[PDB]
Design an enzyme around this catalytic site. Structure first.
Site, PDB file in Angstrom:
ATOM      1  N   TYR A 180      72.640  74.683   0.603  1.00 23.16           N
ATOM      2  CA  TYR A 180      73.550  75.735   0.167  1.00 23.16           C
ATOM      3  C   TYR A 180      73.098  76.354  -1.159  1.00 23.16           C
ATOM      4  CZ  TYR A 180      76.659  73.909   3.813  1.00 23.16           C
ATOM      5  OH  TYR A 180      77.226  73.466   4.971  1.00 23.16           O
ATOM      6  N   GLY A 231      64.218  76.623   9.319  1.00 26.13           N
ATOM      7  CA  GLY A 231      64.750  77.918   8.932  1.00 26.13           C
ATOM      8  C   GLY A 231      65.987  78.353   9.724  1.00 26.13           C
ATOM      9  N   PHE A 232      66.437  77.570  10.722  1.00 28.84           N
ATOM     10  CA  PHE A 232      67.498  78.015  11.627  1.00 28.84           C
ATOM     11  C   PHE A 232      68.858  78.096  10.923  1.00 28.84           C
ATOM     12  CE2 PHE A 232      64.540  76.182  14.976  1.00 28.84           C
ATOM     13  CZ  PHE A 232      64.144  77.402  15.478  1.00 28.84           C
ATOM     14  N   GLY A 233      69.175  77.125  10.060  1.00 25.90           N
ATOM     15  CA  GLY A 233      70.388  77.204   9.261  1.00 25.90           C
ATOM     16  C   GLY A 233      70.397  78.473   8.404  1.00 25.90           C
ATOM     17  N   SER A 234      69.210  78.855   7.913  1.00 30.42           N
ATOM     18  CA  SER A 234      69.064  80.041   7.082  1.00 30.42           C
ATOM     19  C   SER A 234      69.443  81.290   7.869  1.00 30.42           C
ATOM     20  CB  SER A 234      67.656  80.167   6.536  1.00 30.42           C
ATOM     21  OG  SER A 234      67.415  79.206   5.523  1.00 30.42           O
TER      22      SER A 234
HETATM   23  C1  LIG Z   1      80.952  68.475   5.962  1.00 32.14           C
HETATM   24  C2  LIG Z   1      79.745  68.634   5.148  1.00 32.14           C
HETATM   25  O1  LIG Z   1      79.645  68.244   4.025  1.00 32.14           O
HETATM   26  S1  LIG Z   1      78.418  69.411   5.971  1.00 32.14           S
HETATM   27  C3  LIG Z   1      78.568  69.947   7.707  1.00 32.14           C
HETATM   28  C4  LIG Z   1      77.306  70.641   8.125  1.00 32.14           C
HETATM   29  N1  LIG Z   1      76.194  70.170   7.316  1.00 32.14           N
HETATM   30  C5  LIG Z   1      75.314  69.234   7.687  1.00 32.14           C
HETATM   31  O2  LIG Z   1      74.737  68.533   6.856  1.00 32.14           O
HETATM   32  C6  LIG Z   1      75.109  68.987   9.166  1.00 32.14           C
HETATM   33  C7  LIG Z   1      73.708  68.482   9.418  1.00 32.14           C
HETATM   34  N2  LIG Z   1      72.681  69.410   8.965  1.00 32.14           N
HETATM   35  C8  LIG Z   1      72.525  70.647   9.422  1.00 32.14           C
HETATM   36  O3  LIG Z   1      73.234  71.162  10.289  1.00 32.14           O
HETATM   37  C9  LIG Z   1      71.390  71.437   8.792  1.00 32.14           C
HETATM   38  O4  LIG Z   1      70.549  70.523   8.088  1.00 32.14           O
HETATM   39  C10 LIG Z   1      71.853  72.535   7.823  1.00 32.14           C
HETATM   40  C11 LIG Z   1      72.750  73.537   8.558  1.00 32.14           C
HETATM   41  C12 LIG Z   1      72.674  71.911   6.689  1.00 32.14           C
HETATM   42  C13 LIG Z   1      70.636  73.247   7.230  1.00 32.14           C
HETATM   43  O5  LIG Z   1      69.935  73.979   8.274  1.00 32.14           O
HETATM   44  P1  LIG Z   1      68.332  73.787   8.473  1.00 32.14           P
HETATM   45  O6  LIG Z   1      67.999  74.696   9.605  1.00 32.14           O
HETATM   46  O7  LIG Z   1      68.045  72.327   8.487  1.00 32.14           O
HETATM   47  O8  LIG Z   1      67.759  74.407   7.107  1.00 32.14           O
HETATM   48  P2  LIG Z   1      66.618  75.479   6.751  1.00 32.14           P
HETATM   49  O9  LIG Z   1      65.357  75.089   7.449  1.00 32.14           O
HETATM   50  O10 LIG Z   1      67.103  76.861   7.014  1.00 32.14           O
HETATM   51  O11 LIG Z   1      66.492  75.143   5.176  1.00 32.14           O
HETATM   52  C14 LIG Z   1      66.424  76.193   4.161  1.00 32.14           C
HETATM   53  C15 LIG Z   1      65.970  75.639   2.825  1.00 32.14           C
HETATM   54  O12 LIG Z   1      66.896  74.654   2.295  1.00 32.14           O
HETATM   55  C16 LIG Z   1      66.230  73.959   1.254  1.00 32.14           C
HETATM   56  N3  LIG Z   1      66.478  72.506   1.308  1.00 32.14           N
HETATM   57  C17 LIG Z   1      66.267  71.590   0.286  1.00 32.14           C
HETATM   58  N4  LIG Z   1      66.560  70.357   0.638  1.00 32.14           N
HETATM   59  C18 LIG Z   1      66.979  70.469   1.959  1.00 32.14           C
HETATM   60  C19 LIG Z   1      67.426  69.516   2.893  1.00 32.14           C
HETATM   61  N5  LIG Z   1      67.530  68.216   2.636  1.00 32.14           N
HETATM   62  N6  LIG Z   1      67.750  69.966   4.128  1.00 32.14           N
HETATM   63  C20 LIG Z   1      67.642  71.277   4.390  1.00 32.14           C
HETATM   64  N7  LIG Z   1      67.225  72.261   3.598  1.00 32.14           N
HETATM   65  C21 LIG Z   1      66.915  71.783   2.382  1.00 32.14           C
HETATM   66  C22 LIG Z   1      64.736  74.255   1.399  1.00 32.14           C
HETATM   67  O13 LIG Z   1      64.297  75.146   0.393  1.00 32.14           O
HETATM   68  C23 LIG Z   1      64.663  74.857   2.804  1.00 32.14           C
HETATM   69  O14 LIG Z   1      63.481  75.649   2.928  1.00 32.14           O
HETATM   70  P3  LIG Z   1      62.155  74.778   3.383  1.00 32.14           P
HETATM   71  O15 LIG Z   1      62.373  74.332   4.827  1.00 32.14           O
HETATM   72  O16 LIG Z   1      61.025  75.790   3.275  1.00 32.14           O
HETATM   73  O17 LIG Z   1      61.955  73.569   2.470  1.00 32.14           O
END
Ligand SMILES: CC(=O)SCCNC(=O)CCNC(=O)[C@H](O)C(C)(C)COP(=O)(O)OP(=O)(O)OC[C@H]1O[C@@H](n2cnc3c(N)ncnc32)[C@H](O)[C@@H]1OP(=O)(O)O
Ligand SMILES: CC(=O)SCCNC(=O)CCNC(=O)[C@H](O)C(C)(C)COP(=O)(O)OP(=O)(O)OC[C@H]1O[C@@H](n2cnc3c(N)ncnc32)[C@H](O)[C@@H]1OP(=O)(O)O
Lengths: 206, 206
Positions: free
Chosen positions: B177, B141-144
């Protein structure tokens, strides 16, 4: 005879320029086939574009042209240039873009831009939200002068990049940008939160 | 037993946070397969990120976590939240992201953003240059919370949009997203002038 002399000026916009800025943006919405997104107002531009000093935030350069030269001197001073162009320009909408009755000055284009930031360079840049030349004045170098004005400013402030976006399909713009030395990147896609989607986060308690 | 309690805080970064910001950006360059673009320095971030008040220009929210709660109160006040997460988190690089020896605080993520402008709305927005959670802490949930923090700020200032870009191929980010309610637009491509291409405009006399 066929050719004639023409004067150009690129200057910073003031809030008094909002009517012409508004109309230019409208023409862009028409060209982009995105009139359904166009809700800009004159009072909105006047209220939000000029809350900071130029270059510190949102900034606009206007391009004006005329058959008579401009007045003398009225972080930036205007660029002036004299062109030898062909007979009169056919510009029906000229009166819509004229600051003055007794005057043959016309706004022919603009660029609207602001500081962005490159993470990976740890350097600010400029992002161009709009660059536009009205139809009658295209293919005469004016887009070049507009982009050049922003580029020079960037180099002067030691910024790392100038950036903007282009439509998929917009072949003419893409050739223009490549000719200016830009790279069109294929891997990035724009993501947007807006409207109810955005507003919903007002209630969310986390 | 299996689960344990964990405290989180989202706060504005200060210039003193530059080492952790630097490292986070690096990890992003690694993940994006764009280390060849990474030339950021600590002195560069410290010199360019904090020349204005928060929200007026470049701004950073940091996410920190801890097994102990934070101190009381030390246009924005920090968000705090208590999580029930699973056993310890395996975080090898924890020491790289710890502000203090005698301390189990760790930086777990961040978002870096600034005001942009929608021409067509005549409204400022926010553009997110970076949003990132380190591997050990994903899917909790931290990205959220990070995106929510920027969204709320936008609604509070009456901005029109929040925007950023995503890689073509980045399926996990895209699902994130879309789940947050963003639209991934297919028609825009990023254009960039930089390096010698940019510098060349310093000599150009027009
Ligand atoms: C340059 C580019 O294209 S991207 C640059 C940054 N993006 C990245 O991919 C970097 C690496 N990843 C990250 O930093 C993180 O995974 C983030 C920021 C993208 C997401 O933050 P997280 O804290 O992982 O996500 P969070 O827990 O808030 O997820 C919210 C919801 O997203 C949805 N979701 C669906 N598929 C996914 C997935 N593969 N990963 C994450 N969330 C997902 C879900 O509904 C999730 O809720 P749930 O945990 O109950 O299933
Ligand atoms: C949302 C989007 O995708 S785009 C939004 C804005 N873009 C638009 O297409 C709006 C409509 N068009 C315009 O505003 C203008 O055509 C601009 C701003 C794109 C270009 O400005 P102009 O003043 O027409 O261009 P300029 O005369 O400076 O052209 C410079 C060079 O570009 C190169 N070029 C190649 N093909 C083209 C083309 N189809 N159109 C323009 N330049 C072209 C040429 O080398 C040209 O030099 P030349 O005139 O000696 O041949």
């Amino acid at each position: 005879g066929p050719l004639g002399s023409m004067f150009s000026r690129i200057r910073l916009a003031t809030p008094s320029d909002v009517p012409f800025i508004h109309k230019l943006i409208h023409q862009m919405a028409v060209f982009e086939r995105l009139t359904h997104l166009f809700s800009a107002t004159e009072s909105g531009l006047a209220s939000t574009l000029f809350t900071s000093r130029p270059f510190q935030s949102f900034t606009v350069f206007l391009l004006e042209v005329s058959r008579s030269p401009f007045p003398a001197t009225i972080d930036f001073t205007p660029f002036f240039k004299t062109h030898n162009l062909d007979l009169p320009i056919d510009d029906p909408e000229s009166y819509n873009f004229s600051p003055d009755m007794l005057n043959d000055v016309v706004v022919a284009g603009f660029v609207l831009f602001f500081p962005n930031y490159s993470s990976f360079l740890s350097k600010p840049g400029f992002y161009i939200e709009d660059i536009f030349v009205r139809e009658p004045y295209r293919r005469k170098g004016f887009g070049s002068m507009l982009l050049t004005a922003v580029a020079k400013q960037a180099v002067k402030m030691g910024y790392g990049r100038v950036e903007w976006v282009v439509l998929d399909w917009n072949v003419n713009a893409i050739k223009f940008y490549e000719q200016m030395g830009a790279q069109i990147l294929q891997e990035w896609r724009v993501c947007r939160l807006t409207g109810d989607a955005l507003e919903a986060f007002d209630q969310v308690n986390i």
